[PDB]
């Protein structure tokens, strides 16, 4: 495709210009906007289907509300490409999700029309409420509007926000963008009720057709000046306007521009262990596709649990299953495990319950940017007593360490990144490895590289030119102290490498052990720096952070 | 009743109901006399040891009925939070152990699995019961076992987001479980919330009188045998049967068994008021902990800038984010152990956007008889790894005031952590002045050993330092760490010692170690802090001594390294 002809959209580069068009033009503007959207997303890749579902709703909102003075908050923000296109950024969409281009989601630093950097779901009601409370105290006459999906509304913090808005009699509008969809279909008790609020203290209106610009513009006009907590139920269709996205809402949730993934390796381990042990239970907070429980859910429907977007519940539910003697596996991205932290600590680890966490998207995740980076799980997990914390270096180690944490009688974490690995051979057996034991991959001298994770291949390259010792550390928390102690006595430099924050990370565990035993060897900690890495392709981000061979080699040489 | 008995009461029927099995052999005509005896024993023993008071009083009839109608321990009973579960413990082979309650080596504060097969789920934090119960019911049905599952959740606990996530899921799996809403119109403070002022797939019964044993047994029997998501609305009174407690539900939430400086939370409360008197932008947030965090005076003087979000730690932090987007200045008062539940909101909504939000982290460190479920053991570890966080550890009351001011005036996310209880009782500067960020204060010049203290062990460290003639630093700042001072002491002394009331793993001491390693400074480093296990409940002094964090334990560790 090439740049579609869109003369009307070209007269609506900002809400004020859009607000100078006539209602008779909005209908045509929608077709134009859908065309430009389809065009640019095909040029760069990105999220697709949900943006198409809110083209009409996004036009109406900027037409009826005094944005940017009126505050508009988008939940998740993956459906916000139309919003960006109408807020001075249409002509920059060709840079979307590229280094130094537009970010994946609304970002305050990127435009005055983005009230709240989003990425994680279910924060919009809370943020809109806070803006509304502040606006009221300062006597401003601002509208506060939150657009939340029926999937994002399943999170507990959205219930908390709706309860609190009722309490403070907040003048805000919550717009429920109900399209019956999540990434997968929306499965949950609330989804069933949405198919068929006022009790909670909200003035409910709708449902209305979210693709009826005349109705949308009239409904919004009326609700725009009503007082107190207002709730508009709108019904949209994911992929509206593109036939094969309407047919395939899951596949067209996001598209690419016009060796097995680690998550696939996890999924076959899950199926293989389930065939061998009837105790296994697989849990995901609405990420069946991403974490890849697809086969598992089809082959063992009775042992598969999609808890919706409820990371907290996912974890405490696993704890309860562990009380009865089952073996739950919580599949969760490193960034989303931040939201279940208290359940991991209080309900699982304090009780030393037997729960395995399969921590995907560990490290840098690329175009989705810093809201989704898996930068912290080794730091936040390893300070927790009882936690077995593991960092596989390739597909085969992922399988083995899954097996090892699974069989371990206690809470265990295996983290691994998005994408593929060095494509080494995978042993089909299902046997564990000894806990707390590293593996020496290269016997060298002078400098030793203690690798926790998938930088091992890069460290081996470094090691051929330096003749370094290379250790495939497998465990962070049950640290292999004996190995570290001998390495510290036989080398002049220990170098730790990890795709995790340097502060509090795996290298610091080595450092703590060094300090406690009075071992005086020099130590160089390589890992993620103390700032939020800007979106780019994963290799660009790794290079920026010095976690490619060139970066590792340079830092090692300069230390020596 | 009007007095707490000082001598063990006569409880002939209670003595015949030492476990549910024998409780179930009594007759309906006896349960109401059992309840009266249970209530008397409860008052007696809680007056002997201290403990949670009013919430158990209100579930005395409910607990009797439950163990009478349900086949416990085979049927799964899960108590939410667990502070109301003393009667549950009295009826489950522990009545004669209640005299050890909340003491070192005695019964714990909450139900705990390793303490009794009658405690299906260790609790302390709230709102986990529906999840844990739904988890047990799913397993039971897959193992083909016919057991019942029951969660007893208070109206306060039900304001939490996870409880909603659990109700939505239970209805979706069509789980065979009973949720009982123990509704007494009360949290710790009055229950403030939209849910308070008041289909998802459950079968709702009630409300019913939670103190009428015959309706309870009748209804419970009925619902024990119904299928699918079952939901019983029961209404109780906090303090039922102890007049003074029904007249003051807040003051009798917990009691002491039957002089110093201000509490750190009281210092915070005073700081919050003074700073609100001079800045009209300041907003105070607590998730239902107005008393504990001590926003009492603030909430009375500045009602329009005080926000209690109920037991909703997550909304609390993201609300603050939004307040700061409009130029207001939110202060989130939150316990270390409870900030664990809003970690994602701090990181993604606050830290990633560098929003101006101050976190006053109370109950940092060991918290005493409440035991490991409430310990503030990790906040230094889980916050210092987050980019953009200013992380601060005051050593006394005046330091607390100064670092609150520093964190507030700082434009961005700041955190000030402090323990429960009182400090060394040093003069407090009435002014509102900040200190320079990232700079420690040399409080003693010695030699050979340098103590780098992050927080309230400073006084104990100063005692060891005078005995050893050591150098002592009051570090004040973990995350913008005083790199120049550490480096100076590393060349000057033979041993650096780090002291903090936080896990050694990932703690402030390891921030020092990270710094030494990156500059290749090779000085011996001894890290004192909290060990890598869960410290069993005791008096705070007893827990701190177990961890080596009093003057004697510090000196022993130092002198032993030397
Ligand atoms: C806390 C959290 N967990 C998981 C995700 C992964 N995720 C990205 S989009 C999405 C589903 C969106 O569903 P919905 O709210 O209805 O938006 P829609 O696409 O249906 O318009 C999910 C689960 C997330 N963004 N945040
Ligand atoms: C996540 C969390 N936040 C805060 C607390 C503090 N807390 C302990 S007990 C209590 C009140 C709970 O009220 P409720 O559930 O209604 O039981 P009641 O005391 O009325 O019987 C609170 C807020 C907690 N236990 N957990
Ligand atoms: Ca796709
Ligand atoms: Ca083999
Ligand atoms: Ca060789
Ligand atoms: Ca160790
Ligand atoms: Ca530093
Ligand atoms: Mg949806
Ligand atoms: Mg209550």
Numbering used by the authors:
A (entry chain F): 38 to 233, 245 to 306, 318 to 619
B (entry chain A): 33 to 230, 247 to 306, 316 to 619
Article excerpt on this structure:
The enzyme is responsible for the formation of 1-deoxy-D-xylulose 5-phosphate (DXP) by condensation of pyruvate and glyceraldehyde 3-phosphate (D-GAP) in the presence of thiamine diphosphate (ThDP), Figure 1. DXP, in and of itself, is an important metabolite in not only the biosynthesis of isoprenoid precursors but also in vitamin B1 (thiamine) and vitamin B6 (pyridoxine) biosynthesis. Native MS data on paDXPS confirmed that the enzyme exists as a dimer in solution, which is consistent with the crystallographic results and suggests that the dimer is the biological unit in vivo.
In the paDXPS structure, the pyrimidine ring of ThDP is π-π stacked against Phe395, while N3 of the pyrimidine is forming a backbone hydrogen bond (2.9 Å) with Ser158. The loop spanning from Asn216 to Trp250, contributing to the ThDP binding site, exhibits a conformational change between the holo and the apo structure of paDXPS. In the cofactor-bound version, residues As217, Met218, Ser219, and Ile220 fold around the diphosphate moiety. The coordination of the co-factor bound Mg2+ by the side chain of Asn216 and the main chain of Met218 appear to stabilize the loop. The ThDP-bound structure also shows the participation of the ser219 and Ile220 side chains, with the latter showing the potential to form an arene-H interaction with the thiazole ring. In the paDXPS structure, the closed conformation is stabilized by interactions of the ThDP diphosphate/Mg2+ moiety with an asparagine-rich region of near the active site.
